Structures are given as structure tokens and as C-alpha cells.
Amino acid sequence: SLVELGKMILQETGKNPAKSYGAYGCNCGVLGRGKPKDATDRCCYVHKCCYKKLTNCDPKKDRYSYDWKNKTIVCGEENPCLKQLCECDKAVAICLRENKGTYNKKRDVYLKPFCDKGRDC
Amino acid sequence: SLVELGKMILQETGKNPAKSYGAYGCNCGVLGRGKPKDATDRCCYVHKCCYKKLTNCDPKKDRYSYDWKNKTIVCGEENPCLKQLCECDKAVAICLRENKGTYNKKRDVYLKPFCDKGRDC
Numbered sequence: 001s002l003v004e005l006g007k008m009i010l011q012e013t014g015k016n017p018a019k020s021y022g023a024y025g026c027n028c029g030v031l032g033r034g035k036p037k038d039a040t041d042r043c044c045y046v047h048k049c050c051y052k053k054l055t056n057c058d059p060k061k062d063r064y065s066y067d068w069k070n071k072t073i074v075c076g077e078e079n080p081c082l083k084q085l086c087e088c089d090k091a092v093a094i095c096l097r098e099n100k101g102t103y104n105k106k107r108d109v110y111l112k113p114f115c116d117k118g119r120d121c
Numbered sequence: 122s123l124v125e126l127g128k129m130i131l132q133e134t135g136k137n138p139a140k141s142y143g144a145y146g147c148n149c150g151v152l153g154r155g156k157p158k159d160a161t162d163r164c165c166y167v168h169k170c171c172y173k174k175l176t177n178c179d180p181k182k183d184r185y186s187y188d189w190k191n192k193t194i195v196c197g198e199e200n201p202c203l204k205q206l207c208e209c210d211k212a213v214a215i216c217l218r219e220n221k222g223t224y225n226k227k228r229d230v231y232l233k234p235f236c237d238k239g240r241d242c
Contacts, residue, residue, distance in 0.1 A: 071218070
């Protein structure tokens with residue numbers, strides 16, 4: 001779920017997930033996909049595509065286990081759905097931390113953001 | 122101050138520092154150094170010994186800034202006692218996380234772990 005997602009993004013970025021990513025760009029926090037506004041947005045685009053792949057489990061509602069180990073997000077190994085769901089969330093939070101370089105809060109979402117159609121996953 | 126220490130320890134071990142380290146061994150979260158029981162205890166031994174040097178500043182009470190960049194505690198610069206403090210705290214957080222493989226609940230301080238006198242720092 002977004003309990004582990006939220007925790008991982010904090011774990012990786014140090015930034016609160018809801019406050020920095022709740023409505024960021026076209027993809028972070030908000031529903032659905034848009035064309036990324038920026039690399040951070042892009043991470044979430046990559047994340048929602050990654051969740052799209054996931055059909056036998058509930059990406060947003062299903063909980064899984066991960067460890068904080070060696071300051072690394074290690075997915076609890078398990079269901080191909082959960083494992084890969086965790087992996088999708090591990091990936092997003094890494095990516096998000098990898099792109100704090102260019103986090104522009106100007107992309108936080110005051111209502112509509114003007115997003116273009118997501119290109120195909 | 123321990124507020125920072127606690128957060129660092131938490132961000133390093135992702136383990137609650139009061140619950141996990143609050144009374145652990147001869148050196149963690151208790152007053153005084155003792156012969157280190159195990160590695161965690163030894164971390165806190167070396168933590169205390171690192172503090173012993175910081176006499177220009179108050180290790181338990183004095184606030185310093187640090188950042189979590191690239192999943193790394195970065196001491197910010199402040200003073201030399203405070204940067205050193207922050208490094209001591211960060212050292213302990215990291216040692217703590219590097220040794221939780223050998224954490225033992227037996228050093229609860231239900232035991233009050235049979236503490237010998239610590240060799241000099």
C-alpha cells in the first residue's frame with residue numbers, strides 16, 4: 001500500500017511523501033498518469049506504469065513487507081504481485097531521491113495542473 | 122542533542138532509539154561507559170567516548186543541524202564541537218545500524234547487563 005510507499009519515500013528522500021509528492025506534477029500523488037513535468041514527476045510516471053503492470057494484487061490497498069536494511073529498501077519476497085509492487089515502490093522512492101536534484105515545488109498541484117496525455121506504458 | 126541522535130539512529134537503523142537503544146548493554150542510552158557487551162553496546166561505548174571530547178558543548182542538550190542527503194546523515198557545519206557532536210551521533214547511528222545483526226534483546230536492561238568497568242576511552 002501507500003503505507004509502505006509513503007514510508008519508503010521518506011526513507012529514501014527524507015522528504016515527507018504527502019507534502020513533497022502528494023500532488024506533484026502529472027503523476028506523483030495525484031490519480032492517473034500525465035506526461036512528466038520533470039524527472040521527479042517522471043519517477044511517478046514510471047511508478048504508475050509499473051503498478052499498471054500489476055493485476056493479481058491491489059497496488060494501492062495491499063500491504064507487503066519490506067525491511068530498512070543497510071539503508072536500503074529490501075522487498076519482502078513473496079507474491080509476484082506484492083514483490084513486484086514493493087519493487088515498484090522501492091523503485092519510485094529511489095528514483096525520487098535520485099532526482100531531488102531537480103525537485104521543483106513549482107510543480108505541486110493547485111487544483112488542475114494542465115497535464116498532457118500520458119504516453120503509453 | 123539526543124533528539125538529533127534519536128532521529129539519526131532511527132533514520133540509520135529505522136529502529137526506535139528509545140525502545141531499541143534506550144537501555145541497552147553497558148553503554149547504550151545509559152549513563153556511563155562499561156566494557157562493551159556486544160557490538161551495539163560497543164557503538165554506544167564509542168559514542169560516549171566520542172562525547173567525552175566534546176566539552177565545549179553539551180552533547181545531550183545542544184541542537185545541531187544535519188541533513189539526510191543521499192540517505193546519508195550529513196552533519197551541517199555549525200561549531201566544531203557541534204559538528205563533532207553530530208559526527209559522534211552519526212557515527213553511533215551508523216555503528217548501531219551496522220551491528221543490528223548482532224543486536225540481542227537480552228541486553229534489554231531487564232538484565233542491567235552485568236557491567237564491567239570500561240577500559241579508558
